[PDB]
Ligand binder design. Structure first.
Ligand SMILES: NC(=[NH2+])NCCC[C@H](N)C(=O)O
Ligand SMILES: O=S([O-])[O-]
Ligand SMILES: O=S([O-])[O-]
Ligand SMILES: O=S([O-])[O-]
Ligand SMILES: O=S([O-])[O-]
Ligand SMILES: O=S([O-])[O-]
Ligand SMILES: [Zn+2]
Ligand SMILES: [Zn+2]
Ligand SMILES: [Zn+2]
Ligand SMILES: [Zn+2]
Length: 270
């Protein structure tokens, strides 16, 4: 393609690495970019967050259409390339770990998300105010995000995504769309916040989903015991917990929330 060539050319121009680390794969199909941007309805008033600008192929399309783009990049060498190779008036590049740095105020996210940060980035995204996020993930991860309570891949991510978002896989994306060619497919994922969020206590969810195949009482007995509290002191309170006849992997957010309120009331949470 025309975009694979431009990549090869910039990599060699700056003498930099095909792969800087292992989850480094650049998107090289203009039509997958155009499809993400049109799925996000990027317009002249939107303020976009992008993570992992890479060589700026997506960033360039975003800057054409949006009013402001913030793009977070860990590697200072990539940043110096983006500054030299593009002329944008409306892009603010942020040096940092996208998981660790404080985020600017934005209404939309449009980004390929490196697989290494897919889980933490998604958890952080779901806790922020935004209209719309269109993001590319590995397919397996994307399928975890839309997994249904009681399915074999339902996990803390699945729960928090259901609790806090509407999540739609827009399309599969082939391995042929990145260089280097990955060994698994990706997916274009749309996220909108729920109008009716189910805000769950993070510590509780973590406690429960540590070992998600466990029944709900066993999960809570083991995790609070390990926090450092006696078994004898909580046995009976925890035996009467709502939804006790489920394994953690089967809980709807609504059922987690009841457990939260039951435990708040019994002094286990404040
Ligand atoms: N394939 C898609 N574009 N799906 C769009 C879903 C729209 C979204 N649920 C909304 O309320 O705006
Ligand atoms: O992360 S890539 O190497 O599949
Ligand atoms: O339009 S971009 O290539 O600066
Ligand atoms: O869509 S997968 O077959 O590359
Ligand atoms: O034994 S104490 O934690 O009530
Ligand atoms: O099912 S819970 O909301 O009582
Ligand atoms: Zn990077
Ligand atoms: Zn797996
Ligand atoms: Zn386990
Ligand atoms: Zn139940």
């Amino acid at each position: 393609s025309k975009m694979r060539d431009r990549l090869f050319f910039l990599l060699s121009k700056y003498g930099i690495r095909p792969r800087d680390s292992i989850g480094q794969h650049f998107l090289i199909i203009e039509d997958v970019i155009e499809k993400a941007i049109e799925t996000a309805n990027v317009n002249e008033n939107d303020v976009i967050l992008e993570v992992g600008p890479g060589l700026g192929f997506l960033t360039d399309e975003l800057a054409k259409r949006a009013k402001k783009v913030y793009t977070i990049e860990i590697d200072q060498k990539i940043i110096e390339i983006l500054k030299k190779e593009y002329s944008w008036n409306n892009v603010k590049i942020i040096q940092g770990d996208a998981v660790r740095v404080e985020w600017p105020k934005f209404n939309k996210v449009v980004s390929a998300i490196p697989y290494k940060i897919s889980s933490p980035f998604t958890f952080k995204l779901l806790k922020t105010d935004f209209e719309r996020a269109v993001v590319m993930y590995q397919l397996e991860f994307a399928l975890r995000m839309v997994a249904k309570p009681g399915s074999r891949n339902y996990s803390r991510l699945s729960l928090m995504a259901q609790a806090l978002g509407n999540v739609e896989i827009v399309m599969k994306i082939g391995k042929g769309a990145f260089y280097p060619r990955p060994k698994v497919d990706s997916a274009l994922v749309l996220i909108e916040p729920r109008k009716d969020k189910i805000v769950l206590n993070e510590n509780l969810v973590k406690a429960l989903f540590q070992h998600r195949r466990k029944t709900v009482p066993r999960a809570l007995k083991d995790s609070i015991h390990m926090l450092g509290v006696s078994k004898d002191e909580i046995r009976g309170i925890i035996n009467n917990v709502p939804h006790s006849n489920k394994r953690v992997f089967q809980l709807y957010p609504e059922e987690v929330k009841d457990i939260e309120e039951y435990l708040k009331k019994h002094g286990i949470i404040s």
